[PDB]
Amino acid sequence: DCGSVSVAFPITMLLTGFVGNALAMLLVSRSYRRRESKRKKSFLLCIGWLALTDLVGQLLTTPVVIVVYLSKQRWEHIDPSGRLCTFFGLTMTVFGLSSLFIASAMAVERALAIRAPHWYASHMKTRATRAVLLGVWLAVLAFALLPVLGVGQYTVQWPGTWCFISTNWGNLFFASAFAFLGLLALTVTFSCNLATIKALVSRGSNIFEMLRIDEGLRLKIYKDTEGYYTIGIGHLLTKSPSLNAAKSELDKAIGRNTNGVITKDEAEKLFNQDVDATVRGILRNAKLKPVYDSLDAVRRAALINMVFQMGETGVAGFTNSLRMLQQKRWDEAAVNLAKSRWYNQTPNRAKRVITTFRTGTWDAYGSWGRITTETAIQLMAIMCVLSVCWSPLLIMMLKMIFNEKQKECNFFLIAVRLASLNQILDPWVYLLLRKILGRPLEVL
Ligand SMILES: CCCC[C@](C)(O)C/C=C/[C@H]1[C@H](O)CC(=O)[C@@H]1CCCCCCC(=O)O
Ligand SMILES: CCCCCCCC/C=C\CCCCCCCC(=O)O
Query: How many Å apart are CA 408 and CA 3, to the nearest integer?
Result: 16
Q: Any known ligand binding at 236?
A: yes
Query: How many Å apart are CA 14 and CA 113, to the nearest integer?
Result: 35
Query: How many Å apart are CA 111 and CA 252, to the nearest integer?
Result: 34
Torsion sign, CA atoms 73, 141, 97, 166: positive
Q: What are phi and psi of 163, to 5 degrees?
A: -120, 145
Q: Give the burial string for 256-274 (b: 16+ CB within 10 Å, else e).
A: eebeeebebebbbebbeeb
Name the nearest CA neighbour of 174 among 194, 201, 144. 144
Name the nearest CA neighbour of 358 among 333, 330, 335. 330
Whether the Cβ atoms of residue 58 and residue 21 lie closer than 8 Å to each other: yes
Residue 291: Cβ within 10 Å count: 22
Query: Cβ neighbours of residue 221 under 8 Å, at least 6 residues apart?
Result: 229, 230, 231, 237, 243, 246, 247, 250, 260, 261
224 is catalytic: yes
Whether the Cβ atoms of residue 385 and residue 429 lie closer than 8 Å to each other: yes
274 is catalytic: no
Catalytic residue among 36, 76, 224, 408: 224
Rg (CA), the chain: 28
Residues forming a β-bridge with 163: 156
Q: Is 13 a pocket residue for ligand 2 (Cβ < 6 Å)?
A: yes
Q: Any known ligand binding at 242?
A: no
- Quick check: helix, strand or coil at residue 158? coil
Q: What are phi and psi of 145, to 5 degrees?
A: -85, 0
Q: Which long-range contacts (CB under 8 A, 24 or more apart) does 243-249 make?
A: 246/221, 247/221
CA 4–ligand 2 middle distance (angstroms): 13
Query: Cβ neighbours of residue 33 under 8 Å, at least 6 residues apart?
Result: none
Query: How many Å apart are CA 182 and CA 97, to the nearest integer?
Result: 7
Query: How many Å apart are CA 230 and CA 232, to the nearest integer?
Result: 7
Q: Which long-range contacts (CB under 8 A, 24 or more apart) does 365-370 make?
A: 365/209, 365/210, 365/213, 366/209, 366/213, 368/203, 368/206, 368/209, 370/441
DSSP H or E stretch at residue 329: none
Name the nearest CA neighbour of 161 among 427, 426, 390, 420. 420
Distances (CA, A) of 354 to 159, 200, 299, 362: 63, 26, 10, 11
Alpha helices (H) in 203-316, listed in sequence order:
206-214, 243-254, 264-284, 288-294, 297-310, 312-316
Ligand at minimal distance from the CA of 102 is: 1
Write out residues with Cβ below 6 Å of ligand 1: 9-10, 13-14, 17, 57-58, 61-62, 65, 92, 95-96, 161-162, 416, 419-420, 423-424
Query: How many Å apart are CA 364 and CA 233, to the nearest integer?
Result: 19
Q: What are phi and psi of 236, to 5 degrees?
A: -70, 125
User: Got the DSSP string for 163-220?
Assistant: EEE---HHHHHHHHHHHHHHHHHHHHHHHHHHHHHHHHHH---HHHHHHHHHT--EEE
DSSP H or E stretch at residue 74: none
- Write down how long the chain is: 444
DSSP H or E stretch at residue 404: none
Residues forming a β-bridge with 238: 229
Q: Which domains does the chain have, with CATH numbers?
A: 8-203+407-443 (1.20.1070.10), 206-359 (1.10.530.40)
43: left (phi > 0), else alpha (psi -120 to 50), else beta? alpha
CA 322–ligand 1 middle distance (angstroms): 61
Question: Experimental method for this entry?
Answer: X-ray
Q: What are phi and psi of 434, to 5 degrees?
A: -70, -50
- Quick check: helix, strand or coil at residue 297? helix
CA 392–ligand 1 middle distance (angstroms): 14
- Quick check: helix, strand or coil at residue 409? helix
Measured at the alpha carbon of residue 97, what is the angle toward residues 96 and 98, in degrees to the nearest 5?
95
Q: Please identify, by atom number, the ligand 2 atom nearest to the C-alpha of residue 428.
A: 2
Query: Cβ neighbours of residue 358 under 8 Å, at least 6 residues apart?
Result: 330, 331, 333, 334
Name the nearest CA neighbour of 94 among 50, 126, 142. 142
Q: Which amino acid is at 171?
A: N
CA 413–ligand 2 middle distance (angstroms): 13
Distances (CA, A) of 98 to 111, 164, 228, 277: 20, 16, 49, 52
Strand 218-223 to 229-232 pairing? antiparallel
Query: How many Å apart are CA 61 and CA 69, to the nearest integer?
Result: 13
Provide the terminal-to-terminal Cα distance of the chain, rounded to the nearest Å. 44
Q: What are phi and psi of 231, to 5 degrees?
A: -155, 165
- Quick check: helix, strand or coil at residue 83? helix
Q: Any known ligand binding at 321?
A: yes
Q: In units of Å, what resolution does this entry have? A: 2.5
Crossing angle for the helix pair 347-359 and 206-214, to the nearest 10 degrees = 150
Q: Which amino acid is at 268?
A: E
Burial class (CB within 10 angstroms; exposed 0-12, middle 13-18, buried 19+) of 431:
buried
Best residue among 1, 9, 393, 396 to mutate for probing ligand 2, ranked by most atoms within 8 Å of CB: 9
Residues forming a β-bridge with 232: 218
Catalytic residue among 215, 274, 332, 374: 215
Query: How many Å apart are CA 171 and CA 150, to the nearest integer?
Result: 9
- Which residue has the least CA distance to atom 17 on ligand 2? 414
Burial class (CB within 10 angstroms; exposed 0-12, middle 13-18, buried 19+) of 312:
middle
- Quick check: helix, strand or coil at residue 225? coil
Name the nearest CA neighbour of 208 among 39, 368, 37, 372. 368
Q: Please identify, by atom number, the ligand 2 atom nearest to the C-alpha of residue 3.
A: 20
Query: How many Å apart are CA 372 and CA 390, to the nearest integer?
Result: 27
Q: Please identify, by atom number, the ligand 1 atom nearest to the C-alpha of residue 424.
A: 13
Name the nearest CA neighbour of 309 among 298, 321, 320, 301. 301
DSSP 350: H
Whether the Cβ atoms of residue 434 and residue 27 lie closer than 8 Å to each other: no
Query: How many Å apart are CA 325 and CA 228, to the nearest integer?
Result: 35
Q: Any known ligand binding at 31?
A: no
Whether the Cβ atoms of residue 158 and residue 413 lie closer than 8 Å to each other: yes
Q: Please identify, by atom number, the ligand 1 atom nearest to the C-alpha of residue 159.
A: 26
Distances (CA, A) of 274 to 30, 352, 411, 416: 42, 21, 63, 58
Q: Give the burial string for 322-331 (b: 16+ CB within 10 Å, else e).
A: bbbbeeeeee
- Which residue has the least CA distance to atom 11 on ligand 2? 13
Distances (CA, A) of 97 to 93, 251, 281, 291: 6, 52, 57, 56
Query: How many Å apart are CA 330 and CA 172, to the nearest integer?
Result: 65
